[PDB]
Design goal:
The chain is of the alpha+beta class. It is about 20% helix and about 40% strand. It has helices at about 1-15, 20, 80-85, 120-140, 160-165, 170-175, 185, 220-225, 260-270, 300-310, and strands at about 25, 45-60, 60-65, 75-80, 100-105, 115, 150-155, 190-205, 235-255, 280-285, 295, 320-325, 335-350, 355-360, 365-375, 380-390, 395, 400-405, 410-420, 425-430, 440-445, 450-455. Strand 15 (about 365-375) and strand 16 form a beta hairpin. GO terms for molecular function: cholesterol binding; metal ion binding; toxin activity.
């Protein structure tokens, strides 16, 4: 009998495979698609640029949904097959051995934190984990307090497949109540952000087994594992940790075009600020009585939701929200990597600008200034017209001041400027950004010409 343990230990260790490669899901791969589209709006020239982007996200913390709830418990034996990447893992149907568990609730004394389950199953482990929690409650709920641990992840909406690579393939099911309208990001009227909050009170983590065989009960042989499909193509893994508490997916729908909208989000999880938007959230782990999906609310309503779950209420045992898998072979943490391409629509506005040239010196100055203007021909393709200022190539005097007013379709602004000591340079720049107002000046002595470049 003891020889069965040995033989089974060698089949698990004998497996050869590349960890950081089996847990890789490759979505669509698209060919590069750089494209543009331009409008003319009062006071601005705005661009709607559609590009091809790729996202690669690696995570060891997997979400827990109503679809996979029964299959997720400390010590569950799973296959690193296709189902795990869809976050709907399939349990290896096989007998099991003892599973030693530990809980990190505060105060835990001596071996009061360690459990053992003889015949691991969902019901058996939840009851055993829930039993311990109820103990810690009555005896330490009042004296000890457990602050929630936050893991916050956010992104901008650019494809449904893009979101599945950041939060997991199960986002389509869990996020359906969000009804992320996606047509109008490509149209360009709204800017949608998605965020994930994971509020962890306690985590149940399994002690590393003394041997791979320990995770299997009766005289299990290497053979019966091969029938169940346990091999290098699909090596075995076990749920190493399960996190209980609260987790929520929330959407933000904005119309502003600030490139710092992500900063306003981070600020509320503690860089522009003021903004009235619409919100819609779906919550898992709330305290029944008052919870569920909540559409409406303006940031402050949201900030209280992030706050209303800052602490374990202690009304009952928490619900699992996230878990982690590990390889049976070497007891390493399994990473899941999701890669894909997607069409990234972006809106960018160029305001109207102005450049003022001033000369207050007793010295002969000569200016040269050029730029380029984008336009649309009859067919509709983006054109280029190289243009220069009329006031270039002429002599300028003591009290000279002139204002050039550029529109938003202007790039590659060049400034040549020379005086007299023949002609002599005093300043030179290229591709000056189109600031609402920039003032170029000059003054001093012919022996010592001086100058200024300023912005407001």
């Amino acid at each position: 009998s003891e020889a069965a343990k040995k033989a089974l230990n060698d089949y698990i260790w004998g497996l050869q495979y590349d960890k950081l490669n089996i847990l890789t899901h490759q979505g669509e791969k698209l060919k590069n698609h750089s494209s543009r589209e331009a409008f003319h709006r009062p006071g601005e020239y705005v661009v709607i640029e559609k590009k091809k982007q790729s996202i690669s996200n690696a995570t060891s913390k997997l979400s827990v949904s109503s679809a996979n709830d029964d299959r997720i418990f400390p010590g569950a034996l799973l296959k690193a097959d296709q189902s795990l990447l869809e976050n709907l893992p399939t349990l290896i149907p096989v007998n099991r051995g003892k599973t030693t568990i530990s809980v990190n609730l505060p105060g835990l004394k001596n071996g009061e934190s360690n459990l053992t389950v003889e015949n691991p199953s969902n019901s058996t482990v939840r009851t055993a984990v829930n039993n311990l929690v109820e103990k810690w409650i009555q005896k330490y709920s009042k004296t000890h307090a457990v602050p929630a641990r936050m893991q916050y992840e956010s992104i901008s909406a650019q494809s449904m497949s893009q979101l599945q690579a950041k939060f997991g393939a199960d986002f389509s099911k869990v996020g359906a109540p969000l009804n992320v309208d996606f047509s109008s990001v490509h149209k360009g009227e709204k800017q949608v952000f998605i965020a994930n909050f994971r509020q962890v009170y306690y985590t149940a983590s399994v002690d590393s087994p003394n041997s791979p065989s320990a995770l299997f009960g009766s005289g299990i042989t290497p053979t019966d594992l091969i029938n169940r499909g346990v091999n290098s193509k699909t090596p075995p893994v076990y749920v190493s940790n399960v996190s209980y508490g609260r987790a929520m997916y929330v959407k933000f729908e904005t119309t502003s075009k600030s490139t710092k909208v992500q900063a306003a989000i981070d600020a509320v999880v503690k860089e522009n600020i003021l903004k009235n938007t619409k919100i819609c959230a779906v919550v898992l782990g709330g305290n029944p009585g008052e919870a569920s999906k909540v559409c409406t609310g303006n940031i402050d309503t949201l900030k209280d939701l992030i706050q209303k779950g800052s602490n374990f209420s202690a009304q009952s045992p928490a619900v699992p929200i996230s878990y982690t898998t590990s390889f049976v072979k070497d007891n390493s943490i399994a990473t899941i990597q999701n890669n894909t391409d997607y069409i990234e629509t972006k809106v960018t506005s160029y305001k109207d600008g102005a450049l003022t040239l001033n000369h207050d010196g007793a010295f002969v100055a000569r200016f040269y200034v050029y730029w380029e203007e984008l336009g649309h021909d009859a067919d509709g393709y983006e054109t280029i017209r190289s243009r220069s200022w009329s006031g270039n190539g002429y002599n300028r005097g003591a009290h000279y001041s002139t204002t050039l007013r550029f529109k938003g379709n202007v790039r590659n602004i060049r400034v040549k400027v020379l005086g007299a000591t023949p002609w002599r340079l005093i300043y030179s720049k290229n591709d000056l950004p189109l600031v609402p107002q920039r003032n170029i000046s000059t003054w001093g002595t012919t022996l010592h010409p001086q100058f200024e470049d300023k912005v407001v």
